[PDB]
Chain A
Amino acid sequence: MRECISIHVGQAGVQIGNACWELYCLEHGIQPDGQMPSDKTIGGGDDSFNTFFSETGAGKHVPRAVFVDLEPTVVDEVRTGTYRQLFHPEQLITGKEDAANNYARGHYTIGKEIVDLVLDRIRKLADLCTGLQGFLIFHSFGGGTGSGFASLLMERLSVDYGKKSKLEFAIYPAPQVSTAVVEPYNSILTTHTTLEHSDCAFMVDNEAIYDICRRNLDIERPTYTNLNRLIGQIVSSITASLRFDGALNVDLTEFQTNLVPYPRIHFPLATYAPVISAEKAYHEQLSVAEITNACFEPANQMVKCDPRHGKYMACCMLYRGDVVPKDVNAAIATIKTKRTIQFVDWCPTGFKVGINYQPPTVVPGGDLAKVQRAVCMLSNTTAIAEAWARLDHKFDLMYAKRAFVHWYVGEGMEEGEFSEAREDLAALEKDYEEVGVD
C-alpha cells in the first residue's frame, strides 16, 4: 500500500529516530507495552497506521526501521530504555569498533563486513512490503561514525535498486563551529561521493536551532530533548499527507518531481513556522497571514543564509489543521505582490501547496503548543552558495598544509580523490551562479 522504510544510519541517527518514534507512537496511541487499550484495532494491520507499523496477528506493531551503529554504548542504552520490547531485536545492528572520525576508516577497512547483514535486513523487509515507495535515511555529516558508512550504503542500495526514491536528512556543519577538525574533511568526502546518487538531501544548522529557542520559545538552556522533538515534528508534518486524509493530497514523489529543477542541486531549506510556547498560544492569536510572514521571515530559517543574499527559486508549503483555501490563496497573492522577496525570473509560478485536515499533535509535558493551524515550508533557493564557499577557503588551507594526512595514508587512503573532490565542489558552485544568472 503506502509505506516507507526507515534507515537510521548513525549514532546521531538513533538520537532523532528515538525522538521521532516517541512522537510516532503517540498519535495512534501505541502503548509502550505494544497493544491498544480495550478498544479494537488488531487485524492484518489495515488502517492509516500500516504505513509505519506491522501490527500483525501477533498484535504488536513492527517498527519498519533499521538502526545501525558503531559504538555499543548508545544503542545499548536505548534498548535498555522504554520502547525496547516494541523494537525488534536484530533490527538493531551494532558493531564493536569506531570509525575514529575518519571517513576513510568508516569507508574501506570497516564497512565491508556489515553490508551483507544490513542488506539482509533490508531485503527481509522488502519481501513483505508491497508499495516500496521510499526510504527515510538519516545520517549526520560530521558523524564521527555516521559520515562514511551511510555513503557506501547509499551506493550499494542505489545500484541494487534503481527505481525508487531517496530522501536524506542530515545535520549540517556549523558555519563558525566545527567540533571535529575532521569535519571539513569528511564533509567534502561525503558530498563528492553522494551528490550523484542522493535523490533529495536536506540540511539544517544546529546553531540556529539553538537560536530560535530563545528567540521565541524562550529557552536559555535547551537540549537534545527539545531539538530532536523539533526535527521529529518536522518529519511528522512532511508525512501527514502520507498518513491522514484531507481535501487534496501530495506525496514524496511529487516533492521530488516539483522541487528539484536540475540534476546536481537538490538542496532546499526547511522551516517550521508556528514554533511558539504555550503562554504565547493561549492569549495570542494564530492565523494564516502572520504565520506566512513568520515562514518567509529570514531569521526564522534555521540556516544562516539570508534569502536577500539570494533569490527564492522553488517553494512547497504544506498546511495542516483546520484551514480553508480562501485565505491561503489571498496570502500567496500578498506574498507574490511584495517586492523584497526577489524571485528568480525563470518560473513565474513556484508554489506547491498541500492541505491536510488533521491537526498536529503535542506530547504531554513537552514544549510545543496545543496548535490548531500549522504550516511547514520547504523551499529551494540560491542563497546557500556561501556555505560551501566558506567550506573551501579552509579546506584549501588544511590540505595545503597536509596536516593529519599521515592518518589517512596510514589507514590506507590516497589523495587523487582528495584532489577531485574540490573540482566536484567547484562544479556545484559554478553551476549555482550559472543557474542564478538569467
Chain B
Amino acid sequence: PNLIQRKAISGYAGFVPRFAWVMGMNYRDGVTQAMDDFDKNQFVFRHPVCQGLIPFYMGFIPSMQDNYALTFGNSTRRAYQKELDRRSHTL
C-alpha cells in the first residue's frame, strides 16, 4: 500500500487515479481521498458473490409584483416564509 497515505511525494512522476471525477485541486487532499474512497468502493466492490433578502434583487420568485403595499424587506421575508406555505413550489 502507501503510507503517509495522505500524500505520496510532491512531484509524483508516477501517476495517480482520480485525475478525473474530482480533480482540479492540488495533490494532497485529492490523492488521499482518491485512494480512500477508491479502496472503500473496491472492498465493497469485492464483497460477496451472492431571513431578509436585501433590496434591488433581480430574479422573479412567484407572485411578488402582483402583491404590493409594503417595503422590499418585509414583503420579501414574508414571501420567504410563505414560499413554504402556499407558493411552496420552491426548493
Q: How far is the CA of A210 from the CA of B50 in the complex (A)?
A: 56
Kindly provide the distance from the CB of A63 to the nearest chain B CB, expressed in whole angstroms.
15
Kindly provide the distance from the CB of B52 to the nearest chain A CB, expressed in whole angstroms.
48
Is residue A170 contacting chain B, with contact meaning CB distance below 8 A?
no
Q: How far is the CA of A373 from the CA of B11 in the complex (A)?
A: 44
Q: How far is the CA of A94 from the CA of B13 in the complex (A)?
A: 8
Asked if B4 and A85 sit within 8 Å, CB to CB, the answer is yes
A75, A80, A85, A94 pick with most chain B CB within 10 angstroms: A80
Asked if B4 and A75 sit within 8 Å, CB to CB, the answer is no
Q: Count B interface residues, CB 8 Å.
A: 9
- Residues of A contacting B13 with CB < 8 Å? 72, 75-76, 94, 96
Is residue A214 contacting chain B, with contact meaning CB distance below 8 A?
no
- Residues of A contacting B24 with CB < 8 Å? none
Asked if A80 and B11 sit within 8 Å, CB to CB, the answer is no
Asked if B4 and A84 sit within 8 Å, CB to CB, the answer is yes
B2, B9, B14 pick with most chain A CB within 10 angstroms: B9
Is residue A90 contacting chain B, with contact meaning CB distance below 8 A?
yes
Is residue B43 contacting chain A, with contact meaning CB distance below 8 A?
no
Is residue B64 contacting chain A, with contact meaning CB distance below 8 A?
no
Query: Chain B 1-29 against A: per-residue CB contact (8 Å), 1 yes, 0 no?
Result: 01010001111111000000000000000
- Residues of A contacting B14 with CB < 8 Å? 72, 76
Is residue A89 contacting chain B, with contact meaning CB distance below 8 A?
yes
- Residues of B contacting A90 with CB < 8 Å? 10-11
Residue of B nearest to A84 (CB): B9
Asked if A89 and B8 sit within 8 Å, CB to CB, the answer is no
- Residues of A contacting B12 with CB < 8 Å? 76
Asked if B11 and A89 sit within 8 Å, CB to CB, the answer is yes
Contact residues of A between 71 and 129, Cβ < 8 Å to B? 72, 75-76, 79-80, 84-85, 89-90, 92, 94, 96
- Residues of A contacting B11 with CB < 8 Å? 89-90, 92
B4, B12, B13 pick with most chain A CB within 10 angstroms: B13
Residue of B nearest to A95 (CB): B13
Q: Which of A72, A75, A80, A94 touches B8 (beta carbons < 8 Å)? A: A80
Asked if A89 and B10 sit within 8 Å, CB to CB, the answer is yes
- Residues of B contacting A80 with CB < 8 Å? 2, 8-9
Residue of B nearest to A94 (CB): B13
Q: How far is the CA of A80 from the CA of B9 in the complex (A)?
A: 7
Kindly provide the distance from the CB of A95 to the nearest chain B CB, expressed in whole angstroms.
9
Residue of A nearest to B2 (CB): A80
- Residues of B contacting A92 with CB < 8 Å? 11
Q: How far is the CA of A89 from the CA of B9 in the complex (A)?
A: 7
Kindly provide the distance from the CB of A36 to the nearest chain B CB, expressed in whole angstroms.
20
- Residues of B contacting A84 with CB < 8 Å? 4, 9
- Residues of A contacting B10 with CB < 8 Å? 89-90
Q: How far is the CA of A84 from the CA of B8 in the complex (A)?
A: 9
Q: How far is the CA of A92 from the CA of B13 in the complex (A)?
A: 11
- Residues of A contacting B8 with CB < 8 Å? 80
Residue of B nearest to A78 (CB): B9
Q: Apart from A76-B13, A84-B4, list 8 A-B contacts with CB within 8 A.
A: A72-B13, A76-B14, A80-B8, A84-B9, A89-B9, A89-B11, A92-B11, A94-B13
- The 6 sampled A-B contact pairs (Cβ below 8 Å) are A72-B14, A76-B12, A79-B9, A80-B8, A89-B9, A94-B13
A residues with a Cβ closer than 8 A to B are 72, 75-76, 79-80, 84-85, 89-90, 92, 94, 96
Q: List 10 A-B pairs, minimum CB-CB distance, nearest first.
A: A72-B13, A79-B9, A89-B10, A76-B14, A76-B13, A84-B9, A94-B13, A89-B11, A80-B9, A80-B8
